[PDB]
Design a protein around this ligand. Structure first.
Ligand SMILES: CCCCCCCCCCCCCCCCCC(=O)OC[C@H](COP(=O)([O-])OCC(O)COP(=O)([O-])OC[C@@H](COC(=O)CCCCCCCCCCCCCCCCC)OC(=O)CCCCCCCCCCCCCCCCC)OC(=O)CCCCCCCCCCCCCCCCC
Ligand SMILES: CCCCCCCCCCCCCCCCCC(=O)OC[C@H](COP(=O)(O)OCCN)OC(=O)CCCCCCCCCCCCCCCCC
Ligand SMILES: CCCCCCCCCCCCCCCCCC(=O)OC[C@H](COP(=O)(O)OCCN)OC(=O)CCCCCCCCCCCCCCCCC
Ligand SMILES: CCCCCCCCCCCCCCCCCC(=O)OC[C@H](COP(=O)(O)OCCN)OC(=O)CCCCCCCCCCCCCCCCC
Ligand SMILES: CCCCCCCCCCCC(=O)OC[C@H](COP(=O)(O)OCC[N+](C)(C)C)OC(=O)CCCCCCCCCCC
Ligand SMILES: CCCCCCCCCCCC(=O)OC[C@H](COP(=O)(O)OCC[N+](C)(C)C)OC(=O)CCCCCCCCCCC
Lengths: 341, 89, 86, 94, 469, 68, 185, 168, 68, 78
């Protein structure tokens, strides 16, 4: 089972290093949008800033307040990282180039994005003080209210292809990406993704609690680090859901005529150049959408909790329960119900 | 057939002999429903039948709605009283 | 694009995931023995892969075009004895 | 030992008041979640239930849209403010 | 018709303020009457007991179920007139009896769950429908959330009804584990004799029967009927019992059970004995409903029990409405109001009612003597049929217990009449306010049926000997 | 300007040794004429290129690794 | 190697026992809800063991994802007092706890069999001794799984139950509103 | 596409004293065979519901004084009353088909409709979009559902061949 | 209504014996229904596997004591 | 107030203009949801007649012939 170990370590290294440099990419992208620069002093152009923030936080005290719990403030960030990471297993970087390769990959991601909420739920119970327990409630109501809207899109597109295998959903996008017939769902999925990560313009609780003496994530040491490797990974993960659902995933220009012209045989070079091209399409798509998280952060102001719950349950949900009726009708009009394969 | 019967029995006993609070009562109800579904799904596998899984999915729906209604009723009790004491209903 | 300093970390992310996907491709291929990985396999396709494992000497995804089977095939048949469920 | 099986083990082991909209949002998330989850069998059996189970799920969704309509027009999720701005008129007895 | 009612009302009520609630109740009242008039000809389909299976094999439609459907509607057009027609246009009776917005929707949903039970042919429809009838009735108890006792009531009824839904589902899953079926039509003389299913089916009967107050788990339901508002008590106390008893009568599950014989005996004794010291009205009438549930339990053991059940359930429902209606009318003539929800609690508050309104007491006597089984009132001809069936099938000790239970129950039934015909100082001599017309005509019509419906007994027997034979 | 052509042309102008020195000290690549050196040994330059905004024409190259 | 994965079901049985005792004994109810989540996970494990991972995932995304989120969402907002497990208050139930345990277990096990002699009805439940052969046929042609079958029967053969569950969910919407939301206007 | 039954049924079952036409008639035939008696019953209920609430408001007004009900309730009244009337008329026609009432005119119209369709080569009761197994499922769901009219409406729309008549 | 259907949407494991029993029920009236006993017993054997289990217990006893 | 509701029964078309102007988030949701079932009812037979018909169904299982067995030969032993 040696190469299985090799394949795990490659994936984990690639994902975690991508997370670490997404922090730097967030800061430098946001800076140049603000007509400044940097971090560009802690490395050769700032390529070691994230590891410096880490190593500082691992040599920092593990301090626990008097009236707090220890175990809950400790395991809850750890379980958040774990749950956020296992969603990476079902994510393909080539046709079957997946560690999981389950036939229920959509449902696995959807059940794990349901397990994610518990970090915010247990945070408020780390503070026996009374206001934090209402601030966590605000931040849970946004997530459970917006997970309905992300799911509904998973179901709308699965009406087009009747399979929960992620690779199969991507292979049906050879003909067309599902962002062309369902372009408005691209905005909706990207809005709700930004909300579920509690990112701006949906960062109500972290700001509302940064003013108050508590109701935020007042951790320190290692738990800080895990929470900031679990936010910047849930971001890539939710961006990946956008990728393999609407943007074709690993798909690109047909590389048939090129590979025919240049190779003549199926060697261990063509397989490499193929997997490079596929993953590169998947990667540049994740890059543009991570850029878009940052682009959105740089521009839009913040929402309030009333505006936000009103946005969800009174504007988005009606459009979706409408789309639930128009698309099956659109298939029934033309005799185009997809098969189970 | 074993695990379901055990969770069901222990949760009925912890529902009956709870002198402490009420959330244990809610929990024991949910665990009883879980154990039922496990009994039924084991039988549905052994028979290679579908009616068991149909009744199971139906139980999941009905149990979730049960908890919703129960936790609105509790909120009404709390509206009026302000504290849900250990031995009140 | 003007601001290369901002795009370098994107170039790190792009190149890391790129090499990760290409390397996993070669590793899956070496696991399979020179063939692209399968996906969305059902009951039938699995039962046939097991039948292939019975016809070849357990050599994974190696195929055989012979019209007639070696005499081991008649005695290599497997049934599967399952534990009672409780 | 599969790579999913190797990974799914390795990672883990290496006084106050409230507004009732705060609670309704959670309480209502249940049934809408059960609706969207009960829609999964349809999307995965959509061909075999051709044009019959289509109509069945539409009557399903319409019945559920009714309850959503009741929720909206009650304005359940709206927050209500007590310290109202006065809009009476100023009237002086002469 | 129920569904289009429930669907339309949701929209029409959300569009409507708190001030239209009475008119909306009046509308659905008239609509139900138009159904019961115009669609009633469908009894012809059930000639010669032609029985139909619907929606696959999930539902079953025969003359039994249709008559139960008409009865539930007749109950639901009388229970709605009580909310939609104010007795007196006084401020007190506005505050005392004002419908809420969502009440009527929950009533109709409970009607639906009641009818899906009786019409059920598979256990899956039963489990879905009993959950519908159960959840709707958790909320109906709780809708008056401005009262402490109702809040306590709904909470207890939720927990102790959830436990019994667990018991029911445990029984169904056992039946399926044994036989690979959810349908009772897959039984017959061969399968009954050949298989040990006695435990697996009595557990069904008990899990359904403890939801209606059968002994010795009567107290929780009695605390609920006492603690809830009177106009909710008159609904919760009846409809759930009709539905579950009708399902157990139609499905000939417990032909000659020893456990059922024991429990039914205990109900007649408890419901007759424990209701003697009660000073409160609702607990008294709840113990009455229990002993009548005992009498109706005794025909789960018969295999030919339709006429006796249908006649008794009909007169029980009529007398049950009428007596609660008399208690509601009498609130005008008492001296002390105990609550905004239960204006009348103690039996000693009806003292002297003869000197205020005597014909209200005539109605109370007719209804009381109907409960006791005094002829020529309909209660005689109902308890007579039960005695015929049990003695025809071989229950003798139980008939003596039945006689004894009727005698013991005369005492708590006559407590009302005795205090009512007593004398009182400070009588009524005049009152410029007047009770509503409709509620008086409804009460009268129920009284006249309890009194004179013995005239039609042969005609009913002929119709039964065609459509049920 | 923050463009790559700037750093490339500058690294062609001033040699790789000065490139690694500038990368290890400033964090940027900058090329310009010498104006002179002080008594501590610190050298001071000036640029004329259009790409360099106001307040970035003149710069320093310290002698000691512990610059202040 | 083979028998390293032989007793996983017994392990889950033991673990479910533990989590039940812990739900019953915990001081703060929040911990009891966490143990309920552990129990739903163990159930999802067992369902994967017997070949129903689809229900494992539906459980994790229904029960844990919504119901338990809500249970914490309640106990976070309400002042649910308690009374820690004791010996003065709960010991009195030990004889009845024990009698109820033995009888209810033996009955829940005897009930599933059709033998006429009582003791044999339990000795049949304890007969889990023999292995079930699994043969391979070639008649299934499609890629139908359990979820597709559920959709087919639920939306064709049993449509009425679906069109009644819609009304159960309407109750789940409409009752909680009526209870919580005071339509004073 | 074959329209050949998968499952046996009864041939000429007698639900009443009079002969049979169909046991699961399509919505179209039920609406096209309606007598004027049915449309009069439609308008009877359509007028009797709003008139019923006016009658009731005359008997016990909602306040102390009579006032005619608002047009809001009258509109909703008329809609539900048409729904009640249609359900009654859909039932009265369906029972003329089952053989429960007098069905002379409907017998002749069906004999004429069916012979004309056989002359044109069309399948009696028609051709469907569905596989035969769903046809049988539809007939099993929808047959004799009018008996549940008090509870729910259900209607046949599928053009299945499992009507309760001889093969020709 | 959903009876006789498998997890793959097909006939279950014990369907055939159920079919024979239902055939012989349709053939017989309640008096003659005794003829359906062995068919029903075959159904119950397919479901619960008792007589075969006892057969194997006898075989195992012979392998267990008569050899050791 | 400035832009309150004029009522559906006091001019439908005027209500529809008011809703499209002040409450699009419901109006266009209703229009979406009504455009599916209605078009499915109306346009489907046109598409079946003029554009193309409905496809012939898929096998779904072994198509067991509806006949009686025939005596064959060839490929026998020896
Ligand atoms: C009013 C409709 C007027 C009308 O006659 O429409 C005819 C129209 C067909 O027109 P056609 O082109 O001449 O085809 C004739 C045959 O019907 C076509 O025969 P077919 O074989 O091609 O049928 C194809 C398919 C065609 O169906 C479709 O795909 C059309 C989809 C329409 C979507 C809705 C609009 O038909 C179906 O499978 C429909 C299944 C019906 C399911 C039963 C629904 C009845 C219940 C309604 C009440 C609600 C139940 C409440 C109970 C709750 C339980 C507690 O059928 C419908 O309108 C179906 C509407 C269903 C709405 C309910
Ligand atoms: C719902 C909440 C969740 C918790 C659930 C807990 C598990 C539930 C257990 C089963 C379901 C509860 C059943 C409720 C009690 C009613 C059972 C019943 O009435 O069935 C009786 C029935 C025979 O009665 P019948 O058909 O009326 O008459 C014909 C008789 N030949 O059939 C029978 O004859 C019964 C069979 C007789 C054997 C009974 C088994 C008892 C074995 C216990 C032995 C205990 C050992 C000794 C004492 C130990 C203490 C130290
Ligand atoms: C071509 C014609 C298209 C017709 C479009 C219909 C116009 C809808 C009019 C509208 O704007 O709705 C406004 C109405 C009231 O809103 P408002 O005045 O602001 O007051 C509420 C706060 N108290 O809002 C409401 O009453 C509630 C509407 C909620 C709608 C959200 C759900 C949309 C579902 C889409 C499916 C459509 C089919 C639904 C039909 C159900 C049939 C059973
Ligand atoms: C809700 C309201 C929806 C009503 C929409 C009606 C629009 C009608 C458009 C008509 C275009 C017809 C073009 C055409 O002929 O399509 C045929 C083509 C089939 O492709 P082909 O490879 O040739 O296979 C055929 C084998 N028989 O391709 C097709 O069969 C499908 C053509 C799809 C046309 C677009 C339909 C969606 C329109 C937007 C509504 C949805 C927006 C969300
Ligand atoms: C690690 C090697 C080491 O040992 O470090 C060597 C150097 C020193 O690090 P530094 O002082 O922080 O960067 C210099 C920051 N100047 C400001 C001061 O690393 C680096 O510059 C970056 C290493 C290559 C980045 C890989 C991506 C001007
Ligand atoms: C039915 C509404 C019940 C609502 C309560 C009102 C009582 C109406 C009783 C009529 C029953 C019937 O006439 O029917 C007789 C039924 C069977 O006949 P059926 O199949 O149901 O056909 C009836 C078709 N109708 C509905 C068009 C008429 O025999 C029974 O076992 C009924 C026993 C009931 C005993 C109660 C007697 C009450 C005195 C009635 C004086 C008018």
């Amino acid at each position: 089972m040696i190469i299985n170990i090799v394949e795990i370590l490659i994936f984990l290294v690639c994902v975690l290093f991508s997370v670490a440099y997404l922090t730097v990419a967030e800061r430098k992208t946001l800076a140049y949008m603000q007509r400044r620069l940097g971090p560009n002093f802690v490395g050769y152009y700032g390529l070691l800033q994230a590891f410096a923030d880490a190593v500082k936080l691992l040599l920092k005290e593990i301090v626990l307040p008097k009236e707090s719990n220890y175990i809950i403030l400790v395991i809850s960030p750890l379980i958040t990282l774990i749950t956020a990471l296992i969603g990476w297993v079902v994510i393909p970087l080539g046709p079957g180039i997946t560690l999981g390769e389950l036939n229920l990959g959509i449902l696995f991601s959807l059940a794990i994005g349901s397990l994610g909420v518990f970090g915010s739920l247990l945070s408020g119970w780390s503070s026996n003080s009374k206001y934090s327990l209402l601030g966590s409630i605000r931040s849970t109501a946004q997530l459970i209210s917006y997970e309905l809207i992300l799911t509904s899109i998973f179901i709308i597109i699965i009406m087009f292809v009747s399979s929960l295998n992620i690779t199969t959903i991507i292979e049906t996008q050879r003909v067309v990406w599902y962002c062309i017939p369902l372009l408005p769902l691209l905005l909706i999925f990207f809005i709700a993704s930004v909300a579920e990560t509690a990112r701006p313009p949906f960062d109500l609780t972290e700001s509302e609690s940064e003013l108050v003496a508590g109701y935020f994530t007042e951790y320190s040491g290692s738990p800080f680090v895990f929470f900031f490797l679990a936010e910047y990974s849930n971001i890539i993960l939710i961006s990946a859901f956008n990728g393999y659902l609407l943007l074709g995933g690993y798909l690109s220009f047909n590389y048939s005529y090129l590979f025919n012209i240049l190779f003549n045989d199926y060697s261990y070079v063509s397989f490499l150049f193929e997997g490079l091209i596929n993953s590169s399409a998947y990667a540049i798509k994740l890059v543009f959408l991570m850029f878009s998280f940052i682009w959105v952060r740089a521009a839009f102001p913040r929402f309030t909790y009333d505006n936000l719950i009103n946005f969800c349950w009174i504007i988005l949900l009606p459009l979706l329960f409408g789309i639930f009726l128009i698309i099956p009708s659109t298939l029934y009009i033309f005799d185009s119900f997809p098969t189970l394969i | 057939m074993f695990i379901g019967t055990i969770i069901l029995v222990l949760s009925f006993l912890g529902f009956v002999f709870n002198r402490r609070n009420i959330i244990l009562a809610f929990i024991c109800l949910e665990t009883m429903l879980l154990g039922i579904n496990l009994i039924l799904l084991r039988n549905s596998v052994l028979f290679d039948d579908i009616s068991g899984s149909l009744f199971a999915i139906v139980i999941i729906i009905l149990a979730g709605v049960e908890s919703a209604i129960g936790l609105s009723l509790l909120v009404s009790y709390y509206r009026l009283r302000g504290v849900i004491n250990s031995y009140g209903i | 694009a003007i601001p290369f300093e901002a795009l370098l970390p994107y170039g790190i992310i792009f190149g890391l995931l790129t090499a990760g996907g290409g390397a996993m491709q070669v590793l899956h291929v070496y696991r399979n023995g020179g063939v692209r990985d399968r996906f969305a396999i059902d009951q039938w396709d699995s039962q046939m892969m097991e039948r292939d494992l019975r016809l070849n000497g357990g050599q994974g995804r190696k195929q055989v075009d012979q019209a007639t089977a070696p005499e081991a095939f008649k005695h290599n048949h497997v049934w599967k004895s399952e534990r009672p469920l409780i | 030992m599969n790579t999913f099986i190797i990974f799914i083990i390795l990672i883990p082991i290496v006084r106050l008041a409230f507004n009732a909209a705060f609670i309704l949002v959670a309480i209502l998330f249940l049934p809408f979640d059960l609706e969207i989850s009960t829609l999964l069998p349809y999307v995965m059996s959509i061909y075999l239930v051709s044009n019959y189970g289509f109509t069945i799920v539409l009557l399903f969704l319409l019945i559920l849209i009714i309850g959503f309509v009741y929720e909206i027009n009650t304005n359940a999720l709206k927050i209500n403010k007590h310290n109202k701005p006065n809009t009476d008129s100023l009237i002086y007895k002469l | 018709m129920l569904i289009l009612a429930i669907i339309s009302l949701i929209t029409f009520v959300s569009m409507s303020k708190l001030s239209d609630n009475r008119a909306i109740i009046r509308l659905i009242n008239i609509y139900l009457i138009l159904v019961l008039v115009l669609d009633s000809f469908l009894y012809l389909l059930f000639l010669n007991n032609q029985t139909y299976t619907v929606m696959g094999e999930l539902l079953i439609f025969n003359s039994f179920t249709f008559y139960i459907d008409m009865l539930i509607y007749f109950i639901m057009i009388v229970i709605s007139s009580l909310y939609g027609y104010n007795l007196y246009n006084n401020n007190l009776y506005k505050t005392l009896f004002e419908p809420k917005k969502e009440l009527i929707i929950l009533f109709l949903i409970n009607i639906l769950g009641a009818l899906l039970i009786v019409h059920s042919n598979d256990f899956i429809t039963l489990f879905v429908a009993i959950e519908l009838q159960s959840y709707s009735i958790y909320l109906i108890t709780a809708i008056y959330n401005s009262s402490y006792k109702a809040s306590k009531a709904s909470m207890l009824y939720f927990f102790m009804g959830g436990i019994l839904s667990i018991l029911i589902a445990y029984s169904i899953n056992t039946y399926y584990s044994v036989l690979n079926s959810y349908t009772l039509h897959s039984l017959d003389s061969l399968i009954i004799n050949t298989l040990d299913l006695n435990l697996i089916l009595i557990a069904l009967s008990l899990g359904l029967l403890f939801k209606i107050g059968i002994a010795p788990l009567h107290k929780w339901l009695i605390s609920i009927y006492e603690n809830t508002p009177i106009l909710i008590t008159i609904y919760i106390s009846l409809i759930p019992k009709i539905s579950i008893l009708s399902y157990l009568v139609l499905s000939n599950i417990s032909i000659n059970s020893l456990v059922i014989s024991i429990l039914a005996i205990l109900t007649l004794l408890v419901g007759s004995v424990g209701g003697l010291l009660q000073i409160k009205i609702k607990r008294l009438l709840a113990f009455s409903g229990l002993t009548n549930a005992g009498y109706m339990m005794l025909l789960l053991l018969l295999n030919n029990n339709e006429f006796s059940y249908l006649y008794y359930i009909t007169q029980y429902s009529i007398s049950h409405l009428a007596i609660f209606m008399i208690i509601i009318f009498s609130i005008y003539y008492i001296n002390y109001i105990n609550n905004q929800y239960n204006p009348i609690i103690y039996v000693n508050q009806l003292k002297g009612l003869i000197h205020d309104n005597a014909y209200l007491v005539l109605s109370m006597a007719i209804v009381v003597f109907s409960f006791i089984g005094i002829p020529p009132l309909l209660g005689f001809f109902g308890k007579l049929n039960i005695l015929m069936s049990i003695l025809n099938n071989g229950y003798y000790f139980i008939s003596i217990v039945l006689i004894v239970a009727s005698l013991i129950s005369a005492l708590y039934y006559l407590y009302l009449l005795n205090v009512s015909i007593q004398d009182k100082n400070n009588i009524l001599i005049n009152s410029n306010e007047t009770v509503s017309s409709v509620l008086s005509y409804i009460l009268s019509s129920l009284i006249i049926l309890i009194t004179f419906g013995f005239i039609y007994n042969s005609l009913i027997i002929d119709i039964f000997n065609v459509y049920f034979n | 300007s923050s463009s790559l052509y700037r750093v490339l042309r500058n690294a062609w102008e001033v040699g790789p040794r000065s490139y690694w020195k500038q990368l290890n000290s400033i964090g940027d690549t900058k090329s310009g004429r010498l104006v002179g050196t002080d008594i501590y040994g610190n050298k001071f330059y000036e640029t004329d290129h259009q790409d360099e905004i106001h307040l970035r024409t003149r710069y320093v190259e310290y002698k000691e690794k512990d610059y202040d | 190697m083979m028998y390293l994965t032989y007793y996983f079901i017994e392990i889950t049985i033991f673990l479910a026992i533990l989590c039940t005792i812990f739900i019953i004994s915990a001081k703060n109810p929040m911990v009891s809800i966490l143990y309920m989540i552990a129990l739903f996970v163990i159930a999802a494990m067992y369902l994967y063991l017997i070949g129903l991972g689809i229900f494992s995932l539906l459980y994790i995304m229904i029960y844990i994802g919504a119901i338990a989120v809500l249970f914490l969402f309640i106990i976070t907002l309400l002042d649910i007092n308690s009374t820690e497990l004791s010996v003065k208050s709960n010991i009195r139930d030990l004889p009845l706890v024990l009698i109820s345990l033995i009888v209810l277990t033996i009955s829940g096990l005897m009930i599933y069999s059709n033998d006429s002699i009582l003791i044999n009805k339990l000795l049949e439940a304890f007969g889990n001794d023999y292995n079930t052969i699994i043969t391979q046929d070639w008649f299934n042609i499609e890629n139908t799984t359990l979820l597709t079958t559920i959709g087919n029967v639920l939306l064709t053969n049993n449509a009425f139950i679906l069109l009644v569950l819609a009304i159960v969910l309407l109750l789940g919407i409409i009752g909680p509103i009526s209870i919580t939301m005071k339509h004073k206007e | 596409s074959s329209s050949t039954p998968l499952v046996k049924t009864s041939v000429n079952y007698s639900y009443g004293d009079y002969p049979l036409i169909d046991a699961d008639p399509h919505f179209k035939r039920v609406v096209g065979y309606m007598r004027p008696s049915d449309y009069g019953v439609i308008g009877l209920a359509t007028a009797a519901l709003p008139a019923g609430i006016c009658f009731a408001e005359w008997l016990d007004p909602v306040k102390g004084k009579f006032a005619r009900p608002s047009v809001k309730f009258l509109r909703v009244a008329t809609m539900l009353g048409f729904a009640v009337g249609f359900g009654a008329a859909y039932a009265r026609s369906s029972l003329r088909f089952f053989g429960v009432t007098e069905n002379a005119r409907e017998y002749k119209k069906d004999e004429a409709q069916m012979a004309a369709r056989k002359a044109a080569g069309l399948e009696p009761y028609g051709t469907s979009s569905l596989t035969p197994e769903l046809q049988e499922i539809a007939a099993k769901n929808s047959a004799h559902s009018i008996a549940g009219l008090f509870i729910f409406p259900w209607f046949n729309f599928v053009n299945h061949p499992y009507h309760g008549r001889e093969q020709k | 209504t959903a009876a006789g259907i498998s997890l793959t949407g097909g006939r279950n494991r014990c369907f055939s014996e159920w079919q024979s029993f239902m055939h012989c029920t349709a053939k017989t009236d309640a008096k003659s229904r005794a003829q359906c006993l062995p068919n029903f017993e075959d159904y119950m054997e397919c479901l619960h596997h008792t007589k075969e289990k006892a057969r194997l217990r006898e075989i195992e006893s012979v392998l267990k004591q008569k050899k050791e | 107030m400035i832009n309150a509701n004029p009522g559906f029964w006091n001019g439908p078309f005027r209500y529809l203009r008011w809703s499209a102007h002040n409450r699009p988030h419901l109006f266009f949701a209703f229009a979406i949801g009504i455009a599916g079932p209605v078009a499915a009812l109306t346009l489907t037979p046109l598409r079946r007649k003029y554009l193309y018909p409905d496809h012939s169904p898929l096998p779904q299982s072994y198509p067991l012939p509806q006949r009686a067995r025939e005596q064959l030969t060839g490929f026998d032993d020896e």
